[PDB]
Structure 1
Amino acid sequence: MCDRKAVIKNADMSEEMQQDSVECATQALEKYNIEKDIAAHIKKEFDKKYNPTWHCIVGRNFGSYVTHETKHFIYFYLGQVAILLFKSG
């Protein structure tokens, strides 16, 4: 399948939310290789476990500044695609 190993070099978020998002991302990567679907699943899991609303983005060549809430902006990369679940609020 795909090496969905989320190595959080910079994790400015809740550990439990980050671990739940990483497990959901690993399951979604095992299901399919769609990075957009993986990011949507991560955002949905973060918003379900930490109330509305949470946004997560997965891409390859992108640079974004996270404007999110404290303990909810998880930037975990399953390899090189930095899935930054910056829950804005």
Structure 2
Amino acid sequence: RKAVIKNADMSEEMQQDSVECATQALEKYNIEKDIAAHIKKEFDKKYNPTWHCIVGRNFGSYVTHETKHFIYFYLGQVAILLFKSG
């Protein structure tokens, strides 16, 4: 559904691709762990490992990421955190 980006330290191409990838993941999967897995795997292939993805409605996080490889956005009420580290 509607994608709203709140935070990003990421190129415009990866930002839009992250949304597109998450959008397809959310259409394909209902379970967050599987939505995250889809998004993560696609990023490792296109932008090299190692990415990590968290998908959910209720959480807090504290993570360390590589420069220019972090985004946090919503698709409707579901938040997606995607970043590279390692």
Q: TM-score range by the shorter chain?
A: 0.7 to 0.9
- Residue 81 (structure 1) shift: 2.4
State which drifts further: 50-59 or 73-82. Answer: 73-82
Counterpart-to-counterpart distance in 1, 2:16 and 2:79: 15
Structure 1 residue runs of 5 or longer lacking an equivalent are none
* Equivalent residue, structure 1, for 2:77: 80
1:56 counterpart SS class: strand
TM-score by length of 1: 0.82
Query: Alignment partner for residue 30 of structure 2, among 25, 29, 33?
Result: 33
Matches within 5 A, 1:60-71: 60-71=57-68
- Residue 46 (structure 1) shift: 1.8
Are 2:14 and 1:17 aligned?
A: yes
Structure 2 residue runs of 5 or longer lacking an equivalent are none
TM-score by length of 2: 0.84
Change (3 A) 1:40 1:66: same
- Residue 58 (structure 1) shift: 0.6
Counterpart-to-counterpart distance in 2, 1:80 and 1:12: 22
Q: Give identity over the alignment, percent.
A: 100
- Residue 64 (structure 1) shift: 0.4
- Residue 69 (structure 1) shift: 0.6
State which drifts further: 54-63 or 33-42. Answer: 33-42
Change (3 A) 1:12 1:80: farther
